[PDB]
Amino acid sequence: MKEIDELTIKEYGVDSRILMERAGISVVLAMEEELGNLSDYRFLVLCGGGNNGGDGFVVARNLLGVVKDVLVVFLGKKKTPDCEYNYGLYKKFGGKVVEQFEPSILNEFDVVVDAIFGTGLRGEITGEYAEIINLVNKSGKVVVSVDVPSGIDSNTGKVLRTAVKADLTVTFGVPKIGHILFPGRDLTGKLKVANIGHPVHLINSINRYVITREMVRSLLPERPRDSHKGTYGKVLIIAGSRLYSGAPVLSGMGSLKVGTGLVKLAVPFPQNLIATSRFPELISVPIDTEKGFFSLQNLQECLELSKDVDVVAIGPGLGNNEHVREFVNEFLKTLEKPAVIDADAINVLDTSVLKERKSPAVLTPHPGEMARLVKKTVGDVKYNYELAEEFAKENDCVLVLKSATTIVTDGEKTLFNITGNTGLSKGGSGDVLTGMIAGFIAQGLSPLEASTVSVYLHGFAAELFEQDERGLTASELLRLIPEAIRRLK
Amino acid sequence: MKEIDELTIKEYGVDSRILMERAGISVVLAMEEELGNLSDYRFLVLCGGGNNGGDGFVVARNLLGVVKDVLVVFLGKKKTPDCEYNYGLYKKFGGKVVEQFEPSILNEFDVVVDAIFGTGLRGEITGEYAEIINLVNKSGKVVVSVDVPSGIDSNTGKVLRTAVKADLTVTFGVPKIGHILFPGRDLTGKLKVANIGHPVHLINSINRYVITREMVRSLLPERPRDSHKGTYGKVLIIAGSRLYSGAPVLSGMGSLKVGTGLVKLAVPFPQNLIATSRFPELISVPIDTEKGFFSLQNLQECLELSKDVDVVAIGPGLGNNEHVREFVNEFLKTLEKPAVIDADAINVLDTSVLKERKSPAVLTPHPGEMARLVKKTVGDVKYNYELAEEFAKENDCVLVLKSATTIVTDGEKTLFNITGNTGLSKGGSGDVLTGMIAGFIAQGLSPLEASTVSVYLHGFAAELFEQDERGLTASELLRLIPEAIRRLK
């Protein structure tokens, strides 16, 4: 987006003063929409020396005469040209500026406009800038951040030592990665994206997007009236073990609840019996195992079951021992169908086997599984969208890195999901997702499309739960899926 | 306002490009508010070469990519610098321009944005500019005018040969006289006034204003709980004749319905009896006349009645003969109280008598009475606010020049009233107004204040009539007055 401001000035010819004005009035209009009539309020605008602060000067000037009181605390040393121009206007219009922050100054104001730093922040905040941010965060005033809350790194969502907690953030052109990933997404509060005059072609060129309702609506597969179950595909789910008898059932119904025509589970006996006793619509094939786990002895039976299907999901509750490893790796090596690879199938995966596969795969790890897979720490991989991009690209796969914001990438295109809530922070929610992806592939969506639609809907179903989110369980989530789908349309 | 754009650029330092951008986006936002989501519509923007057309180019550019189709028909020869800059941007953003108008081009569009001429129009429109305006007016498309509908003279409201009929007009800073006076007020349609960044001090400096709800609310006199009728003043109304027995009654009740404590009429016998039989709250003093009209023989009796009062209204239904002339002029010469002078009192008035009076007066003519008074044609005086200013100033009075837009001036301050409807186009509505002004003066408002509040409320009461306005009569209007007052608060 830095390149987008640049191109809009330098090649399209839009004066940078005009972009700055449009940004500032956007902020004024966003505050009106959120606070109602502004004439009642007193405003403290905190301006740095960069263009973020310039945006602040525009806000401050625009509020002059219309609101109860305005004051600018200017906290930079030097001003950029556009910041300077606008400082100059604010002063000519009769606005008051000071350069010293008094702790007690929060006393006489209702709204703090945070125009200290924007996407123009490198490295940690210390000294007075930090002190003032800590003061604002303790003040209980309403906080409006210009562009990104000061102290968020706009490329990662990381807090650079300290950062402003905003009630409202007004950004320009497009959401930035920092608003989308945590902790930054938390500090952004309610996010508005303002159009400030960039050519639309540039806005759309952006290589990374947030999954939206509109995007998902247009990817949902059609339901032609003259159809039968085979129209909507077949899934095989290879899952469960004597230790984990629930996982297969939740994956299976994830597939069915998104509109798949037929789902078959392959689960060690007698645990296979659990599924059909809960959901007799499922087919649950007994696999005869030595000790409760899949092994190479079950390889041939599973390839056979996979000839009549469109997609295979593998992993949930398989257990992670050597015989499961041999089986999963030999199976994936021979299976010439799309694979959705989750949970324990990921823990035992040999990534050489993903490269040599002609057929496509989706991997769906959480950060702990991603860490072990690439042999890094949880902290190195969490929210690391470039690492996810490299891995999908190197292994010719779609990677769905699960978290409160989920990342879906194929190496070229990267998408971020922001639906869901803490109710999904419970075992078995992941199992449902695996099933949703496989089902959507079965219905003819590509792996990336299936993954995009599934993470969105999976989160949206969680938000539809009637009671406190913390009491949500995977079985209730399954029930809410078709409501999510209906509400999408 | 031309001086206001100039000062904001040249002394405050706001780039004129920024004013132009702010104007253009205002227009976009006004259309969204009026038409709802704009993505459904096709736009034809008609641009001249001046700054009005520049504003158009900004609108057109801003609609690019967001709406169904945009096209600019550019109709000037040369472009001003700011128009040129913006033509340049529109073209860079990928916008299509043509320079020839095809009659059939209205076919492929839903909205015509009229940015042909603004306040920068001298003299009559002819040739193609006219043809194109006549085409747009016949087209039945939705029309949005930038600043003023092209062809209105913004200083008078006159149609310069021909002019655009808009559904919506978006103007900047302040309403212009042209939007406020007819025919221009009719062609403006729904008027929005946009703030485009002028310093508030300049906006407020403007010497001429529209009467607003807010202004009138803050002028309404207080009603202290510990009060009695004398707190709210006494009015004497000198009116009626054997020919016109209704006028006194309607003026009298105009005074009472605005909260006056006591109203006395002086009306020739027996016509005085009419008032109390309709409204027995009135005092109606029989005046003994020779032939049904006031004359000098009634001078002493009337000065006597006027000692116990705060204001005297004179004129309605007096008749216009020589003996009435002698009486009115000798009376006004000796009366040392505020006078409200209406109707026949105006027809017989010697204006030398207004200069020599120490006490204040309000005159309330319609254009026919104003014409005869200053010895000009109805067409020279109608909507002629500068003539009204000169006259109030030369005669030390407030002049209230009645019409669908009423002008109230004291020579320094001029106000325009825009309430009311065609239901007041009926005899006797004027009589009610005279009474309202006198009553408000009686309650302690100055003549200009009393006049401002009265014309506003008089019109607002008309709009509250439940049935078709054309069936409104003065007696129903009287009944609606206190509803108007309540709705004001």
Binding site: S26, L29, A30, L191, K192, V193, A194, N195 | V28, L29, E32, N37, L38, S39, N62, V66
Partner: peptide, 6 residues
């Protein structure tokens, strides 16, 4: 919808 995505 013209000014803001939410």
């Amino acid at each position: 919808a013209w000014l803001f995505e939410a």
